[PDB]
Each structure stands twice: as C-alpha cells, then as structure tokens.
C-alpha cells in the first residue's frame, strides 16, 4: 500500500462554528440551539 498524502488544504477562514459561506442550514442549527 502506497503511503497516502498527509493532509489536504486547510482553509484559514472556514470553521464549523463560523462557516464562511451562508445558507439557511446553519441558521437552522443556531435557531434550534436557541429555542
């Protein structure tokens, strides 16, 4: 088995709690955390 790559690119401005791009899905998660 060939040694795979260590890691791919890691975006310096995208996180799971602060996603860079916007959609109603992330607003839905923050909404249900509130109520």
């Amino acid at each position: 088995m060939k040694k795979p790559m260590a890691k791919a690119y890691e975006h310096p401005y995208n996180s799971e709690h602060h996603p860079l791009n916007f959609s109603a899905v992330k607003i839905a998660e923050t909404f249900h955390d509130f109520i």
Partner: protein
C-alpha cells in the same frame, strides 16, 4: 417679599429630594428586553427551520 414677592403662602416642604439616576446599564437591560421581543417576533413569524 414686600416689594418684589407674592403672598406668603403655607406649603409643606418635602425633605426627600427625588432624582432619577442617569445610568448606563439601564439602557443595556432595556435593549436586551427589546431584543427578546424582536427575536420572538422573528421566532414566530420569520422562522423557516422545520
């Protein structure tokens, strides 16, 4: 009083001197209350997550 004053009238002299304290954190609390009211307006009528 005789030359430049009015009639000598009997009143009750309040010793307690009320004064509304002009504070900063009272407006913070007031904004927090209106923020709950506005969020409830959004939560009921502008929530499309379900």
């Amino acid at each position: 009083t005789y030359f430049y004053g009015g009639i000598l009238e009997f009143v009750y002299f309040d010793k307690s001197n009320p004064d509304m304290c002009i504070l900063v954190h009272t407006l913070w609390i007031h904004l927090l209350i209106l923020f709950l009211i506005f969020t409830g307006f959004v939560t009921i009528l502008f929530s499309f997550y379900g």
